[PDB]
Design a protein around this ligand. Structure first.
Ligand SMILES: [Zn+2]
Length: 587
């Protein structure tokens, strides 16, 4: 058994003190730290935050040398060895570790070195109260061995893999418990907020019960939603019996807000997304992740399923559980549809290829993303949408994609068997009464658009495309105010000008020679601002030419731009034939 002692020792310095005790080390024992954390496919080199590491054995300092960016080698010893080090935690995200005088958060991939060769043995973790903040509370899904329930104490994990899958959140925590199908759940909040926890918790109970009913079984015995609340932030990371979320304070509905709003909906969608991951990705997962190799990139083209299906259900289950109506849901659907269809990237990269290169193409994507890559999240979501609709028509509404998820989970998930790249398609190709082979293969390996118009028509859903109100409003929401022209580029407007974020290939901005990073200062010799950009553009029609003045770094460019026929990129979805819904949606 390996023992870990952690103490948030320096709040102002953002430093955790960490001790590791190895009862018996091997000859020239090695210690290593993951270079990436499960669920976030980007090499992050956490080891860089480890500071002043040293070792000791039998009352004497023990020599230890660092042999690589994330690996240490200990001198031989006949006695137990204790390794001491500090960890710098100043990254506000659900991914590494953060610590100041107001709160603390951490993933053990960042704090706990793994003992080479003894990684399958149990790991004990002793969390000591920070001397500077002893009244702080503790929240985590890691099995507790001692201490008051939301306070300091000892925890145990079956092995290193389990250890690094239990994030910790400490501070002046707000904790609201609830139950879904006899299982205990917790909503935990850290940060300034005005959340009506009873109401949010009541909605989570609904979402959660819907999911447990869906799989007809839960892979955990309790679940905790660890939430950091800031002014402007988004993000979440799934775990076997918990999730770490970073959300905006405006997303947590207050006691004085009766109706549902887009922000609170985004939060519920996020929670629904991480929760679903409990089955999809935490238990049911690709074989390449059984076990995880955390020293280097681990390639798999299956994220179209593990992220795609989840990206379809996080919103859909919100309507299915009765949190949002079909109007809100279809707006979200149109948003997704519009995003996938917006750029040329869909014709440059297949969805499986995108999953495979998540480590570079996706996680290290830049301004040219819409022109060169496709989202395995968004397109995977549309694939899921297609399968759900196709399976329903082919089985006369007896087989839903939800049902398929349940079954796939019991077969390959609950059993820890794992899925190979072709498992899901073959599983469907050998399912009595349904054939989706040609469709799925093209959806998965070709670089073209998917046909959902006909599919949605069969369920009474009408699809109409139109020009968004502006370059930054590609939604699934109509507007009596469609634009006649547009840059074919996203931008951030302010009194100082329009900061260009993305330039779409072969469109207006592109031909004029504008680039991401440039700052448009004037259009047709008129000051361009947040206030004036739309007024200025309601004066042109395709074919008109104007001069654009913009700065590239500190150089002022005088460019000529001719407004093209703008793309009808907003896919607005609406139900026109209710009786054709057949239960997919509730009017
Ligand atoms: Zn996800």
């Amino acid at each position: 058994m390996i023992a870990y002692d952690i103490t948030p020792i320096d709040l102002h310095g953002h430093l955790f003190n960490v001790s590791l005790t190895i009862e018996q080390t091997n000859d020239e024992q090695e210690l290593w730290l993951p270079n990436w954390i499960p669920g976030s496919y980007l090499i992050r080199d956490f080891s860089k935050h480890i500071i002043g590491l040293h070792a000791e054995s039998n009352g004497l300092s023990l020599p230890v040398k660092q042999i690589s960016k994330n690996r240490w080698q200990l001198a031989r010893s006949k006695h137990p060895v204790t390794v001491h080090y500090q960890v710098y935690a100043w990254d506000l995200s659900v991914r590494s570790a953060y610590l100041d005088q107001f709160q603390g958060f951490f993933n053990n991939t960042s704090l706990c070195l793994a003992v080479e060769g003894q990684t399958d043995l149990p790991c004990e973790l002793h969390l000591h109260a920070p001397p500077e903040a002893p009244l702080w509370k503790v929240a985590t899904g890691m099995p507790r061995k001692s201490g008051q329930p939301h306070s300091w104490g000892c925890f145990r994990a079956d092995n290193y893999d389990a250890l690094i899958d239990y994030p910790f959140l400490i501070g002046d925590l707000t904790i609201e418990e609830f139950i879904a199908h006899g299982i205990k759940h917790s909503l935990v909040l850290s940060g300034r907020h005005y959340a009506d926890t009873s109401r949010i918790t009541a909605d989570l109970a609904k979402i959660c019960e819907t999911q447990i009913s869906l799989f007809e079984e839960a892979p955990f015995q309790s679940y905790t939603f660890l939430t950091m609340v800031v002014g402007n932030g988004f993000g979440g990371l799934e775990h076997r019996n918990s999730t770490a979320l970073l959300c905006s304070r405006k997303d947590l509905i207050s006691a004085h807000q009766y109706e549902m709003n887009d922000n609170y909906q985004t939060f519920l969608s996020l929670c629904c997304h991480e929760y679903f991951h409990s089955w999809n990705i935490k238990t049911l997962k690709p074989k390449a992740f059984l076990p995880y190799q955390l020293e280097k990139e681990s390639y798999t083209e299956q994220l179209w399923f593990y992220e795609g299906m989840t990206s379809y259900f996080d919103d859909y289950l919100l309507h299915t559980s009765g949190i949002i109506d079909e109007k809100r849901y279809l707006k979200l659907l149109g948003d997704t549809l519009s995003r996938v269809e917006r750029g040329a990237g869909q014709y440059q990269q297949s969805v499986t290829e995108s999953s495979f290169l998540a480590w570079t193409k996706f996680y290290q994507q830049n301004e040219n993303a819409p022109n060169s890559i496709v989202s395995y999240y968004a397109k995977g979501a549309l694939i899921a949408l297609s399968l759900d609709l196709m399976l329903r028509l082919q089985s006369d509404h007896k087989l839903t994609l939800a049902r398929v998820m349940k079954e796939l989970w019991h077969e390959f998930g609950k059993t820890s068997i794992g899925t190979a790249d072709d498992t899901v398609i073959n599983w469907l190709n050998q399912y009595p009464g349904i054939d989706i082979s040609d469709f799925l293969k093209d959806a998965l390996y070709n670089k073209e658009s998917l046909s959902l118009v006909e599919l949605l028509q069969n369920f009474g859903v009408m699809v109409q495309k139109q020009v968004p109100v502006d370059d930054n409003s590609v939604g699934g929401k109509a507007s009596e105010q469609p634009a006649r022209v547009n840059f074919g580029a996203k931008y951030k407007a302010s009194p100082q000008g329009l900061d260009v974020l993305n330039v779409y290939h072969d469109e207006s901005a592109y031909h004029a020679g504008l680039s991401a990073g440039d700052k448009i200062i004037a259009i047709d010799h008129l000051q361009a601002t947040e206030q004036s950009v739309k007024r200025i553009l309601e004066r042109y029609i395709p074919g008109d030419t104007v001069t654009i003045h913009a700065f590239r770094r500190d150089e002022l460019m005088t460019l000529e731009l001719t407004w093209q026929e703008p793309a009808k990129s907003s896919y607005v979805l609406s139900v026109e034939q209710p009786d054709k819904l057949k239960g997919w949606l509730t009017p």
